[PDB]
Amino acid sequence: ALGKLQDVVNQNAQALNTLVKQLSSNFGAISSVLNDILSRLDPPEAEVQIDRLITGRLQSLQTYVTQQLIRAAEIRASANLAATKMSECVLGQSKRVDFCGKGYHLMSFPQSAPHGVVFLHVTYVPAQEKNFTTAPAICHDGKAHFPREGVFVSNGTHWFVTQRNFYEPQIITTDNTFVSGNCDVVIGIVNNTVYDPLQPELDS
Amino acid sequence: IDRLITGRLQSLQTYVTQQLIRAAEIRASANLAATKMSECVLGQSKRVDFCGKGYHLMSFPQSAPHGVVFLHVTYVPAQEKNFTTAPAICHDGKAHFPREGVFVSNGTHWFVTQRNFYEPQIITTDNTFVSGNCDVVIGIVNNTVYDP
Amino acid sequence: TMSLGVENSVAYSNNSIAIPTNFTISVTTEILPVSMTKTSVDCTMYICGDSTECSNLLLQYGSFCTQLNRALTGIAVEQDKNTQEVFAQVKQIYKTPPIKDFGGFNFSQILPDPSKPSKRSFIEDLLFNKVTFNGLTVLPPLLTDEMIAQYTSALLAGTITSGWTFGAGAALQIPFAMQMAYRFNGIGVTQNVLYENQKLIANQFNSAIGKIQDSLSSTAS
Amino acid sequence: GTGVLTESNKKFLPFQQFGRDIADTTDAVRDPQTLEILDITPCSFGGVSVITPGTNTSNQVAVLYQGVNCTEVPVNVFQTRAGCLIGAEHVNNSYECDIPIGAGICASYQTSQSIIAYTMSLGVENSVAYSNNSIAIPTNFTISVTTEILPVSMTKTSVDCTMYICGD
Amino acid sequence: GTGVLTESNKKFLPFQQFGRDIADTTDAVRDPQTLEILDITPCSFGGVSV
Numbered sequence: 001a002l003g004k005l006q007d008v009v010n011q012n013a014q015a016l017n018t019l020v021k022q023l024s025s026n027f028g029a030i031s032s033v034l035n036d037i038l039s040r041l042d043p044p045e046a047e048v049q050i051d052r053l054i055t056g057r058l059q060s061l062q063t064y065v066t067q068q069l070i071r072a073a074e075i076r077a078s079a080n081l082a083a084t085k086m087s088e089c090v091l092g093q094s095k096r097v098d099f100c101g102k103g104y105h106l107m108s109f110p111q112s113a114p115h116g117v118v119f120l121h122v123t124y125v126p127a128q129e130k131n132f133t134t135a136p137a138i139c140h141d142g143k144a145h146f147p148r149e150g151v152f153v154s155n156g157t158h159w160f161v162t163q164r165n166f167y168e169p170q171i172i173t174t175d176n177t178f179v180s181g182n183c184d185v186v187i188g189i190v191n192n193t194v195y196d197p198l199q200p201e202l203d204s
Numbered sequence: 205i206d207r208l209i210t211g212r213l214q215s216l217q218t219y220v221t222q223q224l225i226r227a228a229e230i231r232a233s234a235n236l237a238a239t240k241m242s243e244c245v246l247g248q249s250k251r252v253d254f255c256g257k258g259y260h261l262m263s264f265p266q267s268a269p270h271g272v273v274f275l276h277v278t279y280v281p282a283q284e285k286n287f288t289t290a291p292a293i294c295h296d297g298k299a300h301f302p303r304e305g306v307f308v309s310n311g312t313h314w315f316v317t318q319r320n321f322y323e324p325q326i327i328t329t330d331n332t333f334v335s336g337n338c339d340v341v342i343g344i345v346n347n348t349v350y351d352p
Numbered sequence: 353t354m355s356l357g358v359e360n361s362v363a364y365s366n367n368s369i370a371i372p373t374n375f376t377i378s379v380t381t382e383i384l385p386v387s388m389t390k391t392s393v394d395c396t397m398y399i400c401g402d403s404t405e406c407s408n409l410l411l412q413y414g415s416f417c418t419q420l421n422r423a424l425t426g427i428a429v430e431q432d433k434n435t436q437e438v439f440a441q442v443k444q445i446y447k448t449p450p451i452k453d454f455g456g457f458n459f460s461q462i463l464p465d466p467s468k469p470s471k472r473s474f475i476e477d478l479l480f481n482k483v484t485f486n487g488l489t490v491l492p493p494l495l496t497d498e499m500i501a502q503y504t505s506a507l508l509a510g511t512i513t514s515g516w517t518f519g520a521g522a523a524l525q526i527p528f529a530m531q532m533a534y535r536f537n538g539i540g541v542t543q544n545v546l547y548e549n550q551k552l553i554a555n556q557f558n559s560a561i562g563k564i565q566d567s568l569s570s571t572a573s
Numbered sequence: 574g575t576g577v578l579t580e581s582n583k584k585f586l587p588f589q590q591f592g593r594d595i596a597d598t599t600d601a602v603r604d605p606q607t608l609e610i611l612d613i614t615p616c617s618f619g620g621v622s623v624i625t626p627g628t629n630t631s632n633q634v635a636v637l638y639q640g641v642n643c644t645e646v647p648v649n650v651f652q653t654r655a656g657c658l659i660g661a662e663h664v665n666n667s668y669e670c671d672i673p674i675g676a677g678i679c680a681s682y683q684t685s686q687s688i689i690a691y692t693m694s695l696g697v698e699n700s701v702a703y704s705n706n707s708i709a710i711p712t713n714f715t716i717s718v719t720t721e722i723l724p725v726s727m728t729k730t731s732v733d734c735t736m737y738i739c740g741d
Numbered sequence: 742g743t744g745v746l747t748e749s750n751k752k753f754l755p756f757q758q759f760g761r762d763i764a765d766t767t768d769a770v771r772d773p774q775t776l777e778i779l780d781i782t783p784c785s786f787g788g789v790s791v
């Protein structure tokens with residue numbers, strides 16, 4: 001799991017090793033050691049090979065620095081992403097999908113790690129699905145009723161208005177539903193009694 | 205051969221560096237496309253102009269050679285009418301504010317309508333909530349709030 | 353001197369609000385590059401193609417070959433990872449039912465086409481049609497066009513038949529009409545609007561899909 | 574040059590002796606003695622990779638020659654678009670991808686056990702029981718604590734250019 | 742080379758003279774006259790900031 005961090009480390013380490021190993025290359029020079037060339041050749045002769053050694057080592061340094069800049073840009077992108085998740089997943093609750101883990105995001109907890117961060121994303125995942133018959137609206141007195149917050153479902157005979165993310169059926173009352181238009185327009189609308197809380201109170 | 209090898213190695217290094225930079229750009233685009241898949245396709249996005257100009261309704265992915273094409277289906281309001289708006293309303297000396305919507309007037313009558321679509325409704329205590337007296341709100345108007 | 357756009361003074365007054373009395377269901381298109389061609393370059397063959405003396409001379413340059421090859425291999429693995437991240441966001445490959453009753457909405461132009469040997473949608477066919485050995489080798493992608501088409505078809509089927517639910521966990525079936533009602537509730541427009549203008553919205557959506565088809569077919573820019 | 578000479582259908586002009594391409598490499602030639610055109614194809618070459626389950630698991634490995642037909646190899650041979658895979662037993666059954674070879678082919682070490690290459694499976698098919706009047710609502714939930722590991726910083730390395738290039 | 746020589750606990754084999762590392766730089770040596778092992782450490786150096 002920690003590969004993302006470990007990988008990074010290795011990469012950097014690998015580069016350094018390569019860089020150091022580039023000190024043991026001839027690049028066309030008689031030897032890979034400056035001291036040996038200086039001790040075995042006069043300056044007029046030595047400088048010819050030392051030029052090749054210097055050019056090779058400078059080119060290796062430039063390659064290392066270029067790849068380090070590219071990798072640092074990659075790590076800066078990842079660090080901006082980590083700061084975004086800290087701001088939005090940790091310091092708040094992210095409504096964005098799959099930004100702070102699969103499932104609905106409840107919270108997140110940061111945890112340091114060597115040259116990196118680790119977010120424990122506590123998410124809410126619905127588990128047990130039940131089939132139901134659903135209708136977009138309901139007709140009581142010719143007026144189509146739509147649910148304020150929730151959905152109309154049926155266990156076969158009775159109609160309930162339950163929130164969408166958790167099956168908690170409730171009686172269909174005017175508190176749960178609001179009317180808009182008649183029932184000659186909607187498709188899939190059904191008939192059902194819409195209980196009125198005020199009716200029994202007025203009765204007594 | 206020394207010169208040839210030096211030149212060709214320089215060419216290869218230049219190619220690989222250009223490829224690394226271009227691949228970083230393509231990976232930024234790929235992360236953006238993964239985000240759009242997660243948040244526009246797998247869900248409905250509140251972020252503005254992220255999933256198309258308008259109010260995002262949905263998105264549909266379509267593979268294309270070395271890329272993804274998102275069809276963003278969005279809701280764009282079309283025909284706008286002017287109205288006179290009052291921040292609140294006074295019926296019994298108590299200011300009334302719309303729970304979810306806005307007060308508009310077609311010249312004589314006052315309605316409370318959802319903000320992004322004209323569905324006027326008769327103002328009632330269910331459409332509005334009271335807060336304080338009627339000597340603070342600026343622009344408040346006089347009207348009657350129907351009591352069911 | 354270029355103009356920045358038509359001057360448009362907003363008729364602002366401290367008590368005047370403009371409310372929209374209608375809407376359009378606009379289908380726009382956004383194309384995003386995801387991966388670049390996976391290419392691997394053989395250092396020795398390119399620099400010293402079939403030359404023992406040249407290879408010996410090149411051996412003195414240390415670990416240039418290993419680092420170049422590692423860079424290209426990392427780029428190729430990155431392309432595979434990009435495609436996997438972008439498309440393989442669906443755990444199970446959902447498929448739309450044979451009965452296409454989506455509340456009047458017509459997805460025949462984007463759902464997979466059994467007729468073609470590759471299960472690729474019509475607009476996907478349009479997109480594919482519009483878009484077009486010296487030690488350099490072009491490695492093939494891990495996910496073929498067929499597999500990416502399967503992933504996109506799974507995403508479309510899950511979306512159509514289950515709303516956003518399939519992104520959170522187990523995919524829950526739901527009528528597309530009610531799905532669109534929820535989408536409308538998301539943007540701050542009550543759901544009764546969708547139910548009362550379902551036929552109009554379906555016609556607008558189908559016309560927008562047709563316009564997308566025509567735009568892709570005609571203009572290749 | 575070095576290459577494979579094959580009979581060609583190209584319509585060389587009478588005065589032309591060679592045929593080049595965008596690379597300017599010799600793509601065709603004309604036999605000086607008998608005036609017949611020959612297409613030149615690059616001698617087959619390509620990377621050689623090794624599909625190996627962890628040595629801790631097994632020492633048996635398969636060898637992939639990338640992008641080479643299964644005819645140019647010296648000598649349990651599978652010809653996929655990725656290349657020629659030697660040491661992998663082709664299996665019609667499809668499982669999840671384990672060691673991605675490419676072109677939709679992934680190789681896994683499985684049941685005596687050997688390395689089997691197969692068209693990788695894109696997860697489990699699941700037909701949603703969709704209908705215009707059916708909604709599935711979840712009756713329960715689970716609080717899942719997942720992990721997301723992000724690099725934030727890397728080693729701060731400085732290099733003494735003078736000392737490195739010209740140490741003392 | 743240039744560096745600081747320190748008494749070492751490395752167990753050089755009788756025939757081995759130098760001690761290299763991943764850097765391929767001489768980490769240890771065997772004093773040719775007195776058969777003892779000496780660790781070689783690069784002379785201290787570093788950036789000078791203000």
Ligand SMILES: *[C@@H]1O[C@H](CO)[C@@H](O[C@@H]2O[C@H](CO)[C@@H](O)[C@H](O)[C@H]2NC(C)=O)[C@H](O)[C@H]1NC(C)=O
Nearest residue numbers: 132133153154155156157158159160169170171
């Ligand atoms: C659908 O749900 C309703 C309400 O829970 C069920 O009706 C009740 O059923 C219980 C027994 O399960 C009885 O004790 C109650 O008296 C019933 N109340 C009413 C108002 O009917 C109904 O049986 C359920 N139907 C199905 C098919 O599950």
Ligand SMILES: *[C@@H]1O[C@H](CO)[C@@H](O[C@@H]2O[C@H](CO)[C@@H](O)[C@H](O)[C@H]2NC(C)=O)[C@H](O)[C@H]1NC(C)=O
Nearest residue numbers: 138139140141142143183184188189190191192
């Ligand atoms: C819901 O109830 C209404 C009335 O309560 C039904 O309307 C009836 O429809 C039939 C056939 O179309 C007519 O013959 C009746 O005259 C209608 N009644 C009234 C009062 O107009 C409607 O059909 C019912 N819908 C369902 C699905 O049961």
Ligand SMILES: *[C@@H]1O[C@H](CO)[C@@H](O[C@@H]2O[C@H](CO)[C@@H](O)[C@H](O)[C@H]2NC(C)=O)[C@H](O)[C@H]1NC(C)=O
Nearest residue numbers: 285287308309310311312313314315324325326
């Ligand atoms: C503003 O809206 C109100 C209510 O929608 C309109 O009042 C109606 O006017 C018509 C005129 O033909 C009458 O038949 C109705 O009886 C009135 N309804 C009520 C409840 O009074 C009013 O005309 C509209 N005025 C403008 C300028 O738009």
Ligand SMILES: *[C@@H]1O[C@H](CO)[C@@H](O[C@@H]2O[C@H](CO)[C@@H](O)[C@H](O)[C@H]2NC(C)=O)[C@H](O)[C@H]1NC(C)=O
Nearest residue numbers: 290293294295296297338339343344345346347
């Ligand atoms: C709303 O109604 C109230 C009372 O019905 C108005 O307040 C009156 O204003 C007049 C003139 O300013 C005074 O002479 C009365 O004494 C006030 N009475 C009360 C009870 O406040 C108020 O002006 C009305 N608002 C508008 C915008 O017309």
Ligand SMILES: *[C@@H]1O[C@H](CO)[C@@H](O[C@@H]2O[C@H](CO)[C@@H](O)[C@H](O)[C@H]2NC(C)=O)[C@H](O)[C@H]1NC(C)=O
Nearest residue numbers: 452453454456457458459460461558561562565
């Ligand atoms: C969805 O749209 C397609 C075309 O955009 C419709 O296919 C057409 O169906 C009619 C049926 O009378 C044929 O005459 C046309 O030739 C078809 N066109 C194409 C391009 O195939 C399809 O019928 C639509 N589906 C729904 C449910 O409306």
Ligand SMILES: *[C@@H]1O[C@H](CO)[C@@H](O[C@@H]2O[C@H](CO)[C@@H](O)[C@H](O)[C@H]2NC(C)=O)[C@H](O)[C@H]1NC(C)=O
Nearest residue numbers: 282283373374375376377551552553555556559
């Ligand atoms: C909202 O705008 C749509 C157009 O986007 C209107 O629908 C058109 O209505 C005209 C005549 O009313 C018809 O000729 C067109 O065929 C309709 N187009 C479509 C796509 O259905 C709609 O009537 C408008 N509604 C309101 C209330 O303004």
Ligand SMILES: *[C@@H]1O[C@H](CO)[C@@H](O[C@@H]2O[C@H](CO)[C@@H](O)[C@H](O)[C@H]2NC(C)=O)[C@H](O)[C@H]1NC(C)=O
Nearest residue numbers: 125126127128129167711712713714715716717
């Ligand atoms: C919802 O699911 C949880 C488990 O995720 C259920 O809790 C388990 O219930 C069984 C039987 O009562 C016990 O044996 C387990 O130990 C419980 N698990 C935990 C973690 O406490 C719970 O009963 C389910 N609720 C409903 C209404 O289905």
Ligand SMILES: *[C@@H]1O[C@H](CO)[C@@H](O)[C@H](O)[C@H]1NC(C)=O
Nearest residue numbers: 128129130131132702707709
């Ligand atoms: C809903 O009914 C269909 C009918 O074929 C069934 O396949 C499906 O499993 C049911 N839903 C659940 C959650 O069991």
Ligand SMILES: *[C@@H]1O[C@H](CO)[C@@H](O)[C@H](O)[C@H]1NC(C)=O
Nearest residue numbers: 187188189451453704705706
């Ligand atoms: C669902 O579709 C069937 C036919 O496929 C139709 O008979 C029925 O009336 C439809 N019901 C709803 C609510 O859409």
Ligand SMILES: *[C@@H]1O[C@H](CO)[C@@H](O)[C@H](O)[C@H]1NC(C)=O
Nearest residue numbers: 283284285286287363368370
């Ligand atoms: C609203 O009033 C402004 C004021 O000039 C006018 O320009 C505009 O056309 C009006 N709105 C409509 C829909 O006509």
Ligand SMILES: *[C@@H]1O[C@H](CO)[C@@H](O)[C@H](O)[C@H]1NC(C)=O
Nearest residue numbers: 291341342343344365366367
């Ligand atoms: C709006 O501006 C006009 C100026 O023409 C002013 O008379 C009026 O009082 C203002 N309304 C409010 C609520 O401030």
Ligand SMILES: *[C@@H]1O[C@H](CO)[C@@H](O)[C@H](O)[C@H]1NC(C)=O
Nearest residue numbers: 603604605606607608609610
């Ligand atoms: C030379 O080659 C041509 C090509 O066909 C042939 O006709 C001719 O007889 C040859 N002459 C000799 C001397 O080989």
Ligand SMILES: *[C@@H]1O[C@H](CO)[C@@H](O)[C@H](O)[C@H]1NC(C)=O
Nearest residue numbers: 626627628629630631632682
């Ligand atoms: C080999 O792998 C298995 C699991 O894959 C592990 O349990 C075992 O410890 C490993 N052996 C060694 C020597 O690492």
Ligand SMILES: *[C@@H]1O[C@H](CO)[C@@H](O)[C@H](O)[C@H]1NC(C)=O
Nearest residue numbers: 641642643644652653654656
């Ligand atoms: C390999 O060569 C044979 C005969 O030359 C040919 O039939 C086959 O199609 C070739 N393989 C590929 C993948 O082209």
Ligand SMILES: *[C@@H]1O[C@H](CO)[C@@H](O)[C@H](O)[C@H]1NC(C)=O
Nearest residue numbers: 662663664665666667689690
């Ligand atoms: C795999 O199935 C195909 C046809 O479905 C058949 O021709 C082939 O022989 C099978 N391969 C094996 C190894 O059984």
Ligand SMILES: *[C@@H]1O[C@H](CO)[C@@H](O)[C@H](O)[C@H]1NC(C)=O
Nearest residue numbers: 771772773774775776777778
């Ligand atoms: C040479 O060095 C060895 C190392 O201890 C020593 O034993 C020997 O006496 C030395 N010989 C002379 C001539 O100094």
